[PDB]
């Protein structure tokens, strides 16, 4: 249950400090604060989690902004989960598009409960062998980050698991899929990127 | 228009749907509603949030079905509030389904309506359902130590990141020379 890694966006230190605090001090897992410019929590390779208040979700003026954020996340992540947390009616359409897109949705009463939810999501993904464990350190990171549609954790375990960025560039789609920890079609997309000729 | 369980004839749910959706009442079926031949709804009452097994085995049955995609809807009220976190741990995390809290069954009416509207309407009607060369220049620009001007000149001699990766210090000397040429080969090697 404990030891499992989890990535947290810097903006969450002001937004959800009790969540991060409950993750680290109660459930005792290795949390790492990172610069994930477009998302809250990376809970495994492949899965991102997004927390939003019930007020925010009901205020359907960020209805379209939220949808566009999910779209940006869809490009980088195989599985997407959103936690609607209670704060300290016409939006049923928002929920149905999410469900219809295969996006998992959780409901929380407080930041403490949200931490329990994130802990539990971590274990499920650990049991599925898509667990996140890696060094999370080396500065060839930025080069991998410049590739479109590549999550921070993908780029991370591209630095690790590949001996050279040279050998990464000459790897067959089968081994980039496995070593970069990405999908079968995703491996083809970055392959067409590295192998694109002018 | 959508298939329902006989359990629901003449109820508040059915009364509020009757106008916007037509209902076919079938006997004995495991879900409470069928949206399609690959998707269905399981309804959970405030009443059977009493640590009882009145819903649990139904949800598991649906999980066993190879194609059927179940989505659970539950009455969340002051009394059932305490039991919700366990339902959600079981349904969404253990079973991998969708759970939808709902105050009244009058709220479930509006929800199921919009849930049908979502399902019946064409694919990619919801927003959540292409190589860029500028990005490639940005990516090469990330290799030390090349900026906005050296980047395109390298890609000219070596049309891809692949060809750039297995490029000899000699060939790199020609286009950029000295330290910069060795700085690109050092980046790729080890």
Numbering used by the authors:
A (entry chain A): 1815 to 1902, 1916 to 1964, 1970 to 2030
B (entry chain B): 18 to 146, 153 to 213
Can you quote the paper on this entry?
We then constructed a slightly shorter form of FANCM (residues 1813–2031, FANCMS) and an N-terminal truncated form of FAAP24 (residues 17–215, FAAP24S), and the resultant FANCMS-FAAP24S complex led to successful crystallization and structure determination of the complex. The crystal structure of the FANCM-FAAP24 complex was solved using the multi-wavelength anomalous dispersion method and refined to 2.9 Å resolution. There is one FANCM-FAAP24 complex in the asymmetric unit, which contains residues 1815–2030 of FANCM and residues 18–213 of FAAP24 except that three solvent-exposed loops (residues 1903–1915 and 1965–1969 of FANCM and residues 147–152 of FAAP24) are disordered. However, the relative position and orientation of the two domains are significantly different: the nuclease domain of FANCM is sandwiched between and interacts with the (HhH)2 domain of FANCM and the nuclease domain of FAAP24, whereas the nuclease domain of FAAP24 is far apart from and has no interaction with the (HhH)2 domain of FAAP24. The two nuclease domains and the two (HhH)2 domains form two compact heterodimers, respectively. The structure of the FANCM-FAAP24 heterodimer has the highest similarity to that of the ApXPF homodimer, even though they share ∼25% sequence identity. Nevertheless, no metal ion is found at the active site of FANCM, despite the fact that there is 2 mM MgCl2 in the protein buffer solution. Taken together, we suggest that the variation of two key residues at the active site and the lack of DNA binding ability of the surrounding region render a catalytically inactive nuclease domain of FANCM and account for the lack of nuclease activity of FANCM-FAAP24. Our structural and functional data together indicate that region II (helix α5′ and the α5′-α6′ loop) of FAAP24 plays a critical role in DNA binding and is essential for the localization of FANCM-FAAP24 to chromatin.
FANCM is a key component of the FA core complex, which contains a DEAH helicase domain at the N-terminus and a putative nuclease domain and a tandem helix-hairpin-helix (HhH)2 motif domain at the C-terminus. FANCM can interact with the FANCM-associated histone-fold proteins 1 and 2 (MHF1-MHF2) complex via the region following the helicase domain (residues 661–800) and with FAAP24 via the C-terminal domains to form two stable complexes to bind different DNA substrates, which are crucial for FANCM to facilitate repair of ICLs. The FANCM-FAAP24 complex binds preferentially to single-stranded DNA (ssDNA). It plays a key role in the recruitment of the FA core complex to damaged DNA and the monoubiquitylation of FANCD2 (5,18).
